[PDB]
């Protein structure tokens, strides 16, 4: 949609010229109040929605690297690089399997302060690295911080878990990014509410079906969940289909809530000279299995099922690199 | 190899001409004494091979469409046709899945001396039409004929049961059948011992690690566990790999017991010309699993896992007809 228009007159809160521009077509999410029915009616068919008044990060709206670093307590914190705006997602406990992987993206822990020198230095010194701080919010948190916390509108978010019957709160990630950052598409097997805080996070989504347009990795590759596919290049030749894929776009502001379906693709950029942009979400696991399969199959039902394949391939055969091999054995000249 | 020679100068068993031929190349299988150390090797390491003197099924070598018909008792016994001489083995309890699938034979129960009828009017009359009786060996044989398979050799082949750790004798078969037939490459889940006793047979075994020459159907298919590729006309095109198989055949005769190990790909046909040919198998039940996997795995066991995803995949998805896309999209530009 259009750029929304800020309240006092202030003027538009972004503008085209900060989104990067992509091959498919998008239409946008609903932004609708959490009293609205229609949203009640979004969450429970597991389609997102973002919601404008569910207050559920009040007390965080004040947050900044200052007040941050002031109070954030004194422990360690996961802080990606990149030296293109694209940051590589990768899982260390899989780099085994796949020796010939390296990896684009170095981790490292550190301090609060730690991180906003480092971060106040690229830009004091016209620098081009990229970084993103993604930390749990575990007890080494500071008082102040604590308080901000149990702030949080947990009487709605706790309905919500409750009359979705979902599992419980997995974990909340403090995520604090540098303009132009980027999260290619991927997505995760819980249910999500990404509560944004400081700056805006365009988020581009692809429903569960949209699996042969995006081809994502190996379940045993260390990029497991993530597109194949550069969005900046897009190699037609590997990816055919990614030329029919069509998604749900939005800006997400401070104050605003993005619900983000269970195994639902999402690219997350924060727009372009934009400041930097905080965000925490809320992980919740899916509601249990109905012990009673109930057909027709659901998209991501069926994506979990090609996972567990995968899964349990790798370990009949007592390797994961022999499962490509396999597959192809019994597939060609009798299932193609 | 070479047509044997026939004791008494009897001249040669059979002569080139009468098997049929293919576009692949082929070796003989061994042709051993029970007695030899080297055969016994053989069957330790699942391996074809072709026993001389094992007196297996000594008394039913007296046997022949007359004196059969007439001990054979008065029970019911499979006939199937075929208008070529290519017989389609097909289940009738899969034939569900596959609506779109119209049967190329017709099966039909029948007395016995039914079927010596509707033979001895088709040599009688200049037919084309072709027959082949496989049937059970139950209870309601003659008492005569009990008596020669009591005759059988239990004592040799209940050591090899035994030797091997092998399953219980699920059945035997009784094989007649005419000139000129043919039984398709395919493969079984049991152990076989072929016992010939009238006639001469042509069997083209392939190991189970040529399954990718081999193209089976899939496994929801009627024509499960058989080869797609038609060895009379290989469609090189949708089948390329069967340019790559190389068998083993060899000629069993009355009295020779052919080994068929498990999971082995093989081609069965009676010699033309050569009048109608009596076989009688034994399948067992192969060695139980060894409750700790060792690798590496063989090919045998490879194709049981990929049976095992077909099965359960058609489980899952509550529909055999799926099992092909989700397999492809599970492949397409991710393992290939
Ligand atoms: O949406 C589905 O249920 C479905 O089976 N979709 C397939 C593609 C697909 C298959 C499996 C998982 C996601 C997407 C299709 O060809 O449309
Ligand atoms: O909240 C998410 O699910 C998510 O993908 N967040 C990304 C950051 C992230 C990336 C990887 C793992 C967790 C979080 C973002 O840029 O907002
Ligand atoms: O023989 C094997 O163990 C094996 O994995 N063979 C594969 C083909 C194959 C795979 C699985 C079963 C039978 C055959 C190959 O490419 O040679
Ligand atoms: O004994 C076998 O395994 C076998 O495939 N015998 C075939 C006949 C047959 C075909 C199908 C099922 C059982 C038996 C033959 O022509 O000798
Ligand atoms: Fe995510
Ligand atoms: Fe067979």
């Given at each position: 949609?259009?750029?929304?228009?800020?309240?006092?007159?202030?003027?538009?809160?972004?503008?085209?010229s900060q989104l990067r521009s992509?091959?498919?077509?998008?239409?946008?999410?609903?932004?609708?109040?959490?009293?609205?029915?229609?949203?009640?009616?979004?969450?429970?068919?597991?389609?997102?929605?973002?919601?404008?008044d569910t207050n559920l990060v009040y007390p965080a709206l004040k947050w900044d690297l200052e007040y941050l670093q002031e109070n954030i307590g004194n422990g360690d914190f996961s802080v990606y690089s990149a030296s293109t705006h694209k940051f590589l997602y990768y899982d260390e406990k899989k780099m085994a399997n796949f020796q010939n992987f390296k990896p684009r993206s170095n981790r490292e822990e550190m301090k609060?302060?730690?991180?906003?020198?480092?971060?106040?230095?690229?830009?004091?010194?016209?620098?081009?690295?990229?970084?993103?701080?993604?930390?749990?919010?575990?007890?080494?948190?500071?008082?102040?911080?604590?308080?901000?916390?149990?702030?949080?509108?947990?009487?709605?978010?706790?309905?919500?878990?409750?009359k979705r019957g979902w599992g419980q709160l997995t974990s909340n990630l403090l995520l604090i990014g540098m303009e132009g950052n980027v999260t290619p598409a991927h997505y995760d097997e819980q249910q999500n509410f990404f509560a944004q805080i400081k700056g805006y996070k365009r988020c581009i989504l692809f429903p569960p079906d949209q699996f042969?347009?995006?081809?994502?990795?190996?379940?045993?590759?260390?990029?497991?969940?993530?597109?194949?596919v550069d969005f900046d290049n897009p190699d037609y030749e590997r990816f055919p289909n990614f030329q029919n894929v069509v998604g749900y776009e939005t800006v997400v502001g401070p104050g605003?809530?993005?619900?983000?379906?269970?195994?639902?693709?999402?690219?997350?950029?924060?727009?372009?000279?934009?400041?930097?942009?905080?965000?925490?979400?809320?992980?919740?696991?899916?509601?249990?299995?109905?012990?009673?399969?109930?057909?027709?199959?659901?998209?991501?039902?069926?994506?979990?099922?090609?996972?567990?394949?995968?899964?349990?391939?790798?370990?009949?055969?007592?390797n994961p690199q022999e499962v490509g091999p396999l597959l192809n054995t019994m597939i060609k000249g009798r299932y193609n």
């Open positions: 949609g259009e750029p929304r228009e800020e309240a006092g007159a202030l003027g538009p809160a972004w503008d085209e992509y091959s498919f077509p998008t239409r946008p999410i609903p932004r609708l109040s959490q009293s609205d029915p229609r949203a009640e009616e979004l969450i429970e068919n597991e389609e997102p929605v973002v919601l404008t609060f302060h730690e991180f906003v020198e480092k971060l106040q230095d690229i830009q004091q010194r016209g620098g081009e690295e990229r970084l993103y701080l993604q930390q749990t919010l575990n007890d080494t948190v500071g008082r102040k911080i604590v308080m901000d916390f149990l702030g949080f509108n947990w009487n709605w978010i706790n309905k919500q878990q409750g042969e347009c995006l081809y994502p990795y190996p379940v045993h590759h260390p990029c497991d969940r993530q597109s194949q605003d809530v993005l619900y983000i379906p269970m195994y639902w693709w999402h690219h997350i950029e924060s727009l372009l000279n934009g400041g930097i942009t905080i965000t925490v979400n809320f992980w919740y696991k899916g509601a249990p299995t109905p012990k009673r399969i109930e057909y027709p199959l659901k998209a991501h039902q069926k994506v979990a099922i090609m996972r567990n394949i995968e899964k349990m391939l790798g370990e009949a055969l007592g």
